[PDB]
Design a binder for this molecule. Structure first.
Ligand code: ATP
Ligand code: ADP
Ligand code: ADP
Ligand code: MG
Lengths: 67, 1158, 320
C-alpha cells in the first residue's frame, strides 16, 4: 500500500529477520521462546548471540518469498 | 568511583524532582483545606500519593512513586483549566508553572518569576511586611502602587492577582493625572521626567501637545510654539548626558516623542492654506481627553482620521520607541480604521520592513502590551483556537507574526473562529463559544497578522479569511529619517549629513556589488550598525570614525572576496578616512588559545576570529557559512576558549543538528492522547537555562550551535526568538524569554534554500576560502596525533620524516587525476596523517633494533603508502599506477611500486603472499569463501589497516565488485570486530539504525552506548548510503546522522532529550558511484570525515582464474572431467562479458549484471 | 461585437438569485477564480429570503464533526447550511458527502470550490447544480448592482463611491496598462469607504465637506492598502481626484453629468433623481477606453487578443 511495506520487505530480504518487531518486551519474549525451543529440540546454547544466529539460520533456511 | 558519583548525582536529581512534584501536589491539595471536594477520586489518589511520599521520606531518612505522580498529573487537567478560567492571564503559563503558582499559597514569591511570562513587562514585585508596595518593569524602573495591597494566608493567587491588575491601572492613571496637573501648572518637563513613571510623562506630553496644537490651529501662527518645542528639545538633549541609566532611557523616549512633535509642527508651519494644515492635523495621531466621564480608566481617548479608540491604561514600562516615519503614521491610521469596525489590521510586504515593531508601537501608543506569537507548521486548529480563546478572555491584543506559515487547512478552519470573534466584538456579545465551551468575551481584544508573501514554503490566505482583515503594504521603509533621528538622539555633532551619507552608502553597496542571494542591506542592517555604533562612542567618540568602524564591523564579515575591495573603495570614496583599534588583549587571548589548541594563527584565521568577536560583541545570533571544511567549528571553538580566558566567564556549548531531529522532537509536541505538552530539545535547553535551579547559569555564557543546513521550516520557527522580541512562543501558549547571555550560532555550507527573513535577522560571517595553510594543517594533525598517544625521539624522527616542500607540489599536481565522490584535497589529509601515525605507532615495537637508514627508508615507504591510498585511494587502476609513479618521482628513499608492502621487517610484495587454497567440493555453498588474488589481499589489508586506525571507511564501486565481500574477508579472520548488517532504501530513518543496534548495544550511564561485548569492537556497516532520498529542501537525514555519529561521536536522544556518547562503534559504509541512475549525490560534509576507496571490476583474466579454481572445486565431484575445468571457466567469463556488453541498462531498467550472476 | 450575439438573440439572463429560486435541486456548488469569493452574495441572498445560514469552513476534523452534526440537524428540521473551501477536505467530501448526497422543503446546501483548485469528484459535481461567480464586465451594470445593493449628502456620497468602485474595478482587469499587477477590489473595501464617508459626514455638520480628507483617506488607507507599486498608488490617487473632486459641476463620464444636492430635498426624491440620471446614461461601444481616460492602443490590443482567443475557440468547436 505504501513504501513502508516495501521498506519492511527490503529489511526482511536483505538480512534474514526484522530487528524492528523484536524490541524490548517482544525481544525478551522471543529470547525466552527461542531458549525453550532450543532446549526442547536438544542443543546446548545459552549465549544470546548463538541463539539469535540459530534463529537467523532457521529463518533463512525455512522461509521463501515470492514477489 | 566516577560511575558511583554519577549514579548518586542522578539519584539526587530524581529526588529533587520528586520533592518538587510532591511540593506542588501538597500545595494544591495536601495543605489547603476545602479543596478536596472538587474531585473526590483525585482526592483519594492524592491521599494515597501522600502516604507513598511519607513512606518514601521515612525510608530515605532511615521510580514507582514518580510513575504514580505522572499518572495523577493527568487527573489535574480540568482543575488547571478551571483555574485558568479564574484568571485569564494564566493561559501564557505552562502546566508545571501553573502548579507552582497555585501551590505557593503562602510564599507569595513564586509569582515574581512568572510575572514576566504573564504580563510581559514586569519581572519582579517589591514586597514589604507581607504586602505589595512596588512593581518593577523589565528596564528596572520601579512603579509605586497607589495603595498598598494587603496579603492574607487564606487568599490564593487569582484574587490578589486581580486586585493587583486593577491597582496597576489605577496607579498609572493617578500618576498620569498628577503629571498632567503639573504640566497644566506650567512647569518644565525636565523636573517632571525625574518624578513619575514614563507612561505618565509620555501621555501627558502628548495631551498637552495636541491641546496646544489645536489652540494654535484655531489661529494661524506657529513660530512661537515651534520655537518653544525646539528649545525644549535642546534642553532635554543637554539634560541627557548628566543622569542615571534609567533616566537616560526615559529621556531618550521623551526625545523621540518631542522630535516627532517638532516634525509635525514643522510640517504644519510650512503650510500655506488652512485646508492642507487641517489635513495634516487630522492624519496625525491625537490624544484627546474626556472631561465629563465620571469613570477614571476611560477618561482618555485617542482620535485619528475621525475615529476613536480607548486607552487601556495598562503598564508598558519603558520600551524602545520607534522613530515616527510617515509610513508609520499611515500604518497607524489603517490600524485605527481596521479597529473602528473591530476587524483585524493586516501588514504585509518584504521582510525586514518594520511590521511587528509597527504593531508593537501602536499597542504601546494605545497603552497595552501586545503579545506576539510565531505561527508554525505544528500549529493545528486546536492550539490556534486555544490561543484565540486565551486572548479573548484576557482582552490583550494578539499579533500572529508570520501568519503565512500555517497550513492552508488550518487557515481555512480558523476562519469561522475569526469571524465569530469579530462579530462578537461588533455586536457586543457577552459570551462566545470556542472548543465547544462558552467563554466570556472581553470588549477590548483585537487581532493582527503580519504575513510575508512571495517566499517558498508559505501557503496563501483563503479569501474567506482575508476578507476578514485589512491588508496594508510596507514595501519601502523610510530608512533615512530613522537614521537621522537616531544619530541626533545619540548626540552626534552632525546628524543629517551623516544619515544621508550612511543611507546613500548602503544603497551604493547594495547596487554595486556581486548580486548573490545572501545580500540584504535593508532596515535590519541599518539598525544593527546603529546598535553597534552606540557603544563605540566610549573608545572613539561621536563623529565619522565611529560610524565607519561600525559599518566595517557589521558589513565586512558578510561579504565575499572582491566585494570586500568594492566596500573598501566605496567607504574610502564616500567618507573621509578610516585611528584603528589596538585590540591587543583580545588578539593575545586568541593567540594563546590557538597555541593551546594547536591551531596556526594565520592572517586569514586571525582576521576571521577578530571579525567574529567584534560581531558577537553586540549581535546575539550569528550564521557561519562557507565551503565544506573551511574551519568554522575551529573558529568558533577557539574564540569561545579565548573568551573564557579573557573574561573569566565559564562557557558551555550545546551542539544540535537541526535536520537529524523532527520538529516535534526539537521544539516539542503536544500529545493529543491526553492533551498534555511534551518539551522538545531546544525548548528543554531554554527551560533549563531560564529556570536556573542550580544557580550556576547566572554568570556563564550559553551557546547553542546549529550544525546543519538552514531549513526554512526548521529555522523560521525562531523568527520571534532571533529578532528584537527575543521570546520563544510554544504552541501551548508558553512564552519563554531569551536571556541576554543566550547566544545562537549557525553552521552550514549553502544558503540557496534559506530565506531573507532568517538572513537579515542574524549576523553573517562568510568564509571566502580556507583559513589555514596545508603545511600548518599537517602540523596541527601531527600535534593532535602525538597528543592522542623513546617516545620523544620517535616523535622527533617522524616529524623529521615529512618533507612538505615536495608534499605541496604533489598536492597541487594531484588535481589532474580523476576522482569519484568529489572532495577537495584539503579534506583528505586526515586519513593520510592518521594512517601514517597509526602505522608508525604499531611498528615502533620493532623499531628499537635497526639502523637509522633502514628506519628512515621504512618510514618513508609507509608515508608513501599512506599518501597514495589517501590522495588517490578512490581512483581506478591506471590512475593508481600513475599516482604511485608520481610519488616515487617526487621523493634515495625506498622505492614503492604498485605492490610494495612491508613483511612481518623488509620489503616484499604479494607474489609470495598468495596462499594456496584446498577448496573442497562442498564448500562452494558457503558465501564467505574467498579466493585470494593480488587486488583482493591488497584491498583486504588496507581495509583492515584503515579500520584499525579508528576512522570511517566508505567503499565505492560498481555493484557486485566485492565491497562487502572483502570487508567480510577482512573482519572474519579478526577476533576483535563484529559486523552488523544494515541495508538502506528509498525511505530509511534514524530510528531504523537505532533499532538495528538495540540488540547489539547496551545503554550505560556515566549516557554511553557501549557494545554488548566488553572486548570486541562493533563495526556499523551501513550498506547503500546513497539510497536514502532527499527531502523537499536538499538535505538527507541518514547521511547527516552518520556525519554526527562520526565527527561529534554522539547523538541526541529524541524521547528523553539527553546526549549520548559513543565509545567503541566504528562506521563503515558502501555506496555505488553517483553517476549510476537511481543514485543521488552526497554532501562533502560527510565524505570529509571518511576515507573513500574504489573497488572496481576485476580483469577478465582474474575472473577466469578465480572461476577455474571454482570449476576445479566443482569438478572434484566427477573425476573424469578434470581436464575440462578451464574451457568452462573461459566460456562462463566470455558469456558474462558479452551479456554485459550487449544487454545494457538503456534497454531495460533491470539489466544490471554482476559477478554475482557468475 | 462579441456581446452583440448575447444582446441580440438572447433576451434573458440569470443571476445567482434566479438560479437558487428556479431549481428543484436542494444542493448548489459555487465557484470563483483565485483571490475572489462570493460568500457575501449568499449572505445577502439568505438575508433577503429570511433564512439562517451556517458558515462551516472545512479543513479540520473538529469542523468536519460540527458540519456533520449541523447537516443532520438541518436535514431534520430545516434551514440552510454553507460549506466553505471543500477542496481542503478532499477525503471527507469524497466519502461521506458523496454517500450523503447520492442517498425538508426549506433545506439548501451551498459549497464553494476554486476553479484553479483540485478536481472535485465527478458524481458529486454532476449531482449538484453549478454556479460560477465573477466580476461583472459591464461598468454601468456594476454601478446598477452597487446602487441596488444599498441627509441627501450621504446618498450622494454613496452614489459617487459606487461609481468610483465600478470604475476602478473596470480598470483593474487591464493587466499591462491599467496597473502594474493584477489587483482585485472586493466588497469589503467598498464597505469600509462607505463607513468612513458616513463617519465624516456625521461629524462635519458645518456642510463644508472636506473633500481632500475623503480623497486622501480613500486613495491611501482604504483602497490603497493592497497597493504595492508607487505607480498604482499615483494612478489610484489621480482617478480619486477625478471622481471625488467635490465640485458643483462634476463630469465622471464624458457623457454623464451629476447635479449637486440641494439644501431642501429629502432622501427619497434624491435617490429617484440619481436613479433617473443613471438610467438615462447609455454605455458607448468604446466605454473601456473613453470612460477610464486611457490611450486607445492598449484597449484595442486587449480586446483584439480576447476576441481572437474566443473566435479561435469557437472555430475549433464548430467544426464537429
Ligand atoms: N588555523 C588552523 N590551524 C590548524 N588546523 C586548522 C586551522 N583552521 C582549521 N583547521 C583544520 O580544519 C579542519 C576542518 O575545520 P572544522 O573542523 O572547523 O570544519 P567544519 O567547519 O566543522 O566543517 P564542515 O562545515 O565541512 O562540517 C579541522 O580538522 C582543523 O584541524
Ligand atoms: N521606527 C522604526 N520603523 C521601522 N522599523 C524599525 C523602527 N525601529 C526599528 N525598526 C526595525 O524593524 C524591524 C522589524 O522587523 P519586522 O519586519 O517587523 O519582522 P517580521 O517581518 O518578522 O515581523 C526590527 O528589527 C527593528 O530593528
Ligand atoms: N577472490 C575474489 N576475487 C574477485 N571477485 C570475487 C572473489 N571472491 C568472490 N568474488 C565475487 O564478488 C562477488 C561478491 O560481491 P558483493 O561484495 O556481494 O557485491 P556488493 O559489495 O555490491 O554487495 C561474488 O559474487 C563473487 O563472484
Ligand atoms: Mg516579526
Amino acid at each position: 500500500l505504501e513504501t513502508a511495506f516495501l521498506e519492511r520487505m527490503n529489511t526482511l530480504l536483505a538480512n534474514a529477520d526484522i530487528p524492528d518487531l523484536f524490541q524490548g518486551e517482544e525481544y525478551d519474549k522471543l529470547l525466552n521462546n527461542l531458549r525453550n525451543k532450543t532446549r526442547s529440540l536438544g542443543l546446548l546454547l545459552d549465549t544470546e548471540q548463538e541463539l539469535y544466529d540459530w534463529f537467523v539460520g532457521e529463518i533463512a533456511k525455512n522461509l521463501h518469498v515470492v514477489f | 568511583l566516577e560511575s558511583k558519583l554519577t549514579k548518586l548525582s542522578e539519584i539526587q536529581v530524581n529526588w529533587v524532582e520528586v520533592q518538587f512534584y510532591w511540593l506542588d501536589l501538597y500545595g494544591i491539595l495536601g495543605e489547603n483545606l476545602d479543596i478536596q471536594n472538587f474531585l473526590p477520586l483525585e482526592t483519594s489518589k492524592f491521599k494515597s500519593l501522600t502516604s507513598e511520599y511519607k513512606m518514601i521520606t521515612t525510608r530515605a531518612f532511615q521510580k514507582l512513586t514518580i510513575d504514580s505522580l505522572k499518572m495523577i498529573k493527568s487527573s489535574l487537567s480540568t482543575f488547571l483549566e478551571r483555574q485558568r478560567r479564574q484568571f485569564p492571564r494564566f493561559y501564557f503559563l505552562g502546566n508545571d508553572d501553573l502548579l507552582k503558582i497555585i501551590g505557593s499559597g503562602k510564599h507569595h514569591d513564586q509569582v515574581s518569576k512568572f510575572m514576566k511570562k504573564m504580563f510581559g513587562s514586569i519581572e519582579s514585585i517589591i514586597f514589604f511586611e507581607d504586602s505589595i508596595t512596588g512593581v518593577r518593569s523589565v528596564e528596572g524602573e520601579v512603579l509605586n502602587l497607589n495603595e498598598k495591597i494587603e496579603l492574607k494566608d487564606s487568599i490564593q493567587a487569582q484574587e490578589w492577582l486581580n486586585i493587583l491588575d486593577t491597582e496597576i491601572k489605577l496607579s498609572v492613571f493617578t500618576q498620569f493625572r498628577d503629571c498632567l496637573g503639573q504640566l497644566k501648572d506650567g512647569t518644565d518637563i525636565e523636573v517632571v521626567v525625574s518624578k513619575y513613571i514614563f507612561q505618565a510623562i509620555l501621555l501627558s506630553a502628548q495631551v498637552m501637545w495636541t491641546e496646544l496644537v489645536e489652540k494654535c490651529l484655531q489661529t494661524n501662527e506657529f513660530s512661537k510654539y515651534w520655537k518653544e518645542v525646539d528649545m525644549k528639545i535642546k534642553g532635554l538633549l543637554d539634560k541627557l548626558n548628566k543622569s542615571s541609566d534609567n533616566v537616560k532611557k526615559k529621556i531618550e523616549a521623551l526625545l523621540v516623542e518631542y522630535l516627532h512633535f517638532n516634525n509635525v509642527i514643522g510640517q504644519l508651519k510650512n503650510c500655506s492654506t488652512k485646508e492642507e494644515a487641517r489635513l495634516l492635523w487630522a492624519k496625525v495621531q491625537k490624544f484627546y481627553q474626556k472631561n465629563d466621564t465620571l469613570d477614571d480608566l476611560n477618561s482618555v481617548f485617542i482620535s485619528q482620521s475621525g475615529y476613536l479608540l480607548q486607552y487601556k491604561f495598562e503598564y508598558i514600562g519603558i520600551p524602545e520607541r520607534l522613530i515616527y516615519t510617515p509610513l508609520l503614521l499611515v500604518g497607524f491610521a489603517t490600524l485605527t480604521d481596521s479597529l473602528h469596525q473591530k476587524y483585524g489590521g493586516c501588514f504585509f510586504g518584504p521582510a525586514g520592513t518594520g511590521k511587528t515593531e509597527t504593531v508593537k508601537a501602536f499597542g504601546q501608543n494605545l497603552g497595552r502590551v501586545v503579545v506576539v506569537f510565531n505561527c508554525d507548521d505544528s500549529f493545528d486548529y486546536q492550539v490556534l483556537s486555544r490561543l484565540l480563546v486565551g486572548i479573548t478572555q484576557i482582552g490583550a491584543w494578539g499579533c500572529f507574526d508570520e501568519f503565512n506559515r500555517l497550513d492552508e487547512k488550518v487557515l481555512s478552519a480558523v476562519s469561522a473562529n475569526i469571524q465569530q470573534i469579530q462579530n462578537g466584538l461588533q455586536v457586543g456579545k457577552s459570551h462566545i463559544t470556542l472548543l465547544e465551551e462558552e467563554t466570556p468575551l472581553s470588549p477590548h481584544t483585537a487581532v493582527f497578522i503580519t504575513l510575508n508573501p512571495g517566499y517558498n514554503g508559505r501557503s496563501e490566505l483563503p479569501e474567506n479569511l482575508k476578507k476578514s482583515f485589512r491588508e496594508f503594504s510596507m514595501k519601502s521603509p523610510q530608512s533615512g529619517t530613522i537614521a537621522e533621528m537616531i544619530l541626533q538622539i545619540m548626540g552626534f555633532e552632525d546628524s543629517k549629513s551623516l544619515a544621508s551619507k550612511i543611507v546613500h552608502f548602503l544603497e551604493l553597496l547594495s547596487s554595486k556589488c556581486s548580486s548573490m542571494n545572501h545580500y540584504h542591506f535593508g532596515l535590519r542592517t541599518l539598525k544593527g550598525v546603529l546598535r553597534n555604533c552606540s557603544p563605540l562612542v566610549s573608545e572613539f567618540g561621536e563623529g565619522e570614525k565611529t560610524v565607519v568602524e561600525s559599518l566595517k564591523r557589521v558589513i565586512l564579515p558578510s561579504l565575499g572576496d572582491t566585494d570586500e575591495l568594492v566596500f573598501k573603495d566605496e567607504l574610502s570614496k564616500i567618507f573621509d578616512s578610516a585611528t584603528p583599534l589596538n585590540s591587543k588583549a583580545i588578539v593575545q587571548c586568541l593567540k594563546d588559545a590557538g597555541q593551546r589548541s594547536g591551531f596556526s594563527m594565520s592572517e586569514e584565521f586571525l582576521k576571521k576570529c577578530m571579525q567574529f568577536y567584534y560581531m558577537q560583541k553586540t549581535q546575539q545570533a550569528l550564521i557561519l557559512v562557507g565551503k565544506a571544511g573551511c574551519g568554522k567549528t575551529a573558529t568558533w571553538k577557539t574564540v569561545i576558549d579565548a573568551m573564557a580566558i579573557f573574561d573569566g566567564h565559564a562557557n558551555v556549548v550545546y551542539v544540535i543538528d537541526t535536520k537529524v531531529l523532527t520538529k516535534e522532537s526539537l521544539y516539542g509536541s503536544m500529545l493529543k492522547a491526553t492533551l498534555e505538552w511534551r518539551d522538545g530539545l531546544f525548548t528543554s535547553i531554554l527551560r533549563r537555562v531560564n529556570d536556573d535551579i542550580t544557580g550556576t547559569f547566572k554568570n556563564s555564557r550559553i551557546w547553542v550551535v546549529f550544525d546543519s543546513d538552514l531549513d526554512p521550516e526548521y529555522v523560521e520557527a525562531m523568527n520571534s526568538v532571533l529578532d528584537d522580541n527575543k521570546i520563544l512562543t510554544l504552541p501551548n501558549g508558553e512564552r519563554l524569554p531569551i536571556p541576554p547571555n543566550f547566544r545562537i550560532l549557525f553552521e552550514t555550507d549553502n544558503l540557496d534554500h534559506t530565506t531573507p527573513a532568517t538572513i537579515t535577522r542574524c549576523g553573517l560571517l562568510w568564509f571566502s576560502t580556507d583559513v589555514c595553510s596545508i603545511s600548518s594543517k599537517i602540523d596541527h594533525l601531527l600535534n593532535k596525533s602525538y597528543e592522542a598517544l623513546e617516545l620523544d625521539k620517535l616523535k622527533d624522527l617522524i616529524s623529521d620524516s615529512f618533507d612538505m616542500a615536495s608534499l605541496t607540489n604533489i598536492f597541487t599536481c594531484s588535481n589532474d587525476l580523476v576522482h569519484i565522490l568529489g572532495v577537495r584535497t584539503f579534506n583528505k589529509l586526515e586519513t593520510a596523517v592518521q594512517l601514517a601515525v597509526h602505522l608508525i605507532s604499531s611498528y615502533r615495537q620493532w623499531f628499537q633494533n635497526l639502523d637509522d637508514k633502514s628506519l628512515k627508508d621504512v618510514i618513508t615507504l609507509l608515508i608513501k603508502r599512506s599518501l597514495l591510498y589517501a590522495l588517490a585511494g578512490d581512483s581506478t587502476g591506471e590512475s593508481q599506477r600513475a599516482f604511485i609513479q608520481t610519488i616515487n618521482t617526487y621523493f634515495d628513499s625506498q622505492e614503492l611500486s604498485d605492490y610494495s608492502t612491508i613483511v612481518i621487517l623488509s620489503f616484499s610484495s604479494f607474489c609470495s603472499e598468495i596462499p594456496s587454497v584446498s577448496l573442497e567440493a562442498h564448500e562452494v555453498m558457503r558465501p564467505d569463501i574467498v579466493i585470494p588474488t593480488i587486488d583482493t589481499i591488497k584491498h583486504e589489508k588496507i581495509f583492515y589497516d584503515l579500520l584499525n586506525s579508528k576512522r570511517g571507511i566508505i567503499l565505492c564501486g560498481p555493484p557486485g565488485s566485492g565491497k562487502t565481500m572483502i570487508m567480510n574477508n577482512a573482519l572474519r579472520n579478526s577476533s576483535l570486530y563484529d559486523v552488523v548488517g544494515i541495508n538502506f532504501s528509498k525511505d530509511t530513518t534514524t530510528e531504523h539504525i537505532l533499532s538495528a543496534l538495540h540488540r547489539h548495544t547496551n545503554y550505560v550511564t556515566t549516557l554511553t552506548l557501549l557494545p554488548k561485548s566488553d572486548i570486541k569492537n562493533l563495526v556499523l556497516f551501513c550498506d547503500e548510503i546513497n539510497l536514502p532520498k532527499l527531502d523537499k529542501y536538499g538535505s538527507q537525514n541518514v547521511v547527516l546522522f552518520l556525519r554526527q555519529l562520526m565527527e561529534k561521536q554522539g547523538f541526541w536522544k529524541t524521547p528523553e532529550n539527553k546526549w549520548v556518547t559513543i565509545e567503541r562503534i566504528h562506521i563503515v559504509g558502501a555506496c555505488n558511484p553517483p553517476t549510476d541512475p537511481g543514485r543521488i549525490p552526497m554532501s562533502e560534509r560527510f565524505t570529509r570525515h571518511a576515507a573513500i576507496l574504489y573497488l572496481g571490476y576485476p580483469s577478465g583474466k582474474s575472473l577466469s582464474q578465480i572461476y577455474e579454481i571454482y570449476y576445479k572445486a566443482i569438478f572434484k565431484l566427477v573425476p573424469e572431467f578434470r581436464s575440462y575445468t578451464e574451457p568452462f571457466a573461459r566460456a562462463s567469463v566470455h558469456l558474462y562479458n558479452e551479456c554485459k556488453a550487449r544487454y545494457s541498462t538503456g534497454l531495460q531498467s533491470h539489466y544490471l549484471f554482476s559477478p554475482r550472476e557468475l | 461585437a462579441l456581446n452583440w450575439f448575447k444582446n441580440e438573440f438572447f433576451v434573458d439572463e440569470w443571476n445567482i438569485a434566479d438560479v437558487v429560486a428556479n431549481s428543484e435541486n436542494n444542493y448548489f456548488t459555487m465557484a470563483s477564480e483565485r483571490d475572489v469569493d462570493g460568500t457575501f452574495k449568499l449572505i445577502e441572498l439568505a438575508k433577503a429570503s429570511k433564512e439562517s445560514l451556517k458558515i462551516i469552513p472545512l479543513g479540520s476534523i473538529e469542523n468536519l464533526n460540527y458540519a456533520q452534526e449541523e447537516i443532520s440537524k438541518s436535514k431534520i428540521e430545516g434551514g440552510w447550511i454553507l460549506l466553505q473551501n471543500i477542496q481542503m477536505s478532499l477525503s471527507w467530501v469524497k466519502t461521506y458527502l458523496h454517500k450523503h448526497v447520492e442517498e425538508h422543503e426549506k433545506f439548501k446546501m451551498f459549497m464553494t470550490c476554486h476553479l484553479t483548485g483540485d478536481k472535485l469528484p465527478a458524481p458529486l459535481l454532476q449531482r449538484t447544480d453549478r454556479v460560477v461567480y465573477e466580476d461583472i464586465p459591464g461598468i454601468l451594470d456594476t454601478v446598477k448592482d452597487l446602487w441596488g445593493s444599498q441627509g441627501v449628502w450621504s446618498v450622494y456620497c454613496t452614489f459617487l463611491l459606487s461609481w468610483f468602485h465600478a470604475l476602478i474595478t473596470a480598470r483593474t482587469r487591464l493587466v499591462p496598462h491599467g496597473f502594474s499587477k493584477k489587483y482585485y477590489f472586493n466588497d469589503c473595501d467598498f464597505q469600509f469607504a462607505s463607513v468612513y464617508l458616513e463617519n465624516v459626514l456625521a461629524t462635519n455638520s458645518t456642510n463644508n465637506i472636506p473633500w481632500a480628507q475623503v480623497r486622501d483617506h480613500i486613495a491611501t488607507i482604504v483602497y490603497g492598502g493592497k497597493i504595492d507599486e508607487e505607480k498604482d498608488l499615483e494612478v489610484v490617487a489621480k482617478l480619486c481626484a477625478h471622481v471625488f473632486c467635490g465640485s458643483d459641476n462634476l463630469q465622471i463620464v464624458p457623457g454623464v453629468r451629476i447635479p449637486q444636492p440641494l439644501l431642501q430635498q429629502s432622501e427619497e426624491e434624491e435617490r429617484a433623481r440619481l436613479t433617473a440620471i443613471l438610467s438615462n446614461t447609455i454605455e458607448p461601444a468604446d466605454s473601456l477606453s473613453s470612460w477610464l481616460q486611457l490611450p486607445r492602443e492598449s484597449i484595442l490590443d486587449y480586446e483584439r487578443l480576447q476576441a481572437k482567443e474566443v473566435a479561435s475557440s469557437t472555430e475549433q468547436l464548430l467544426q464537429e
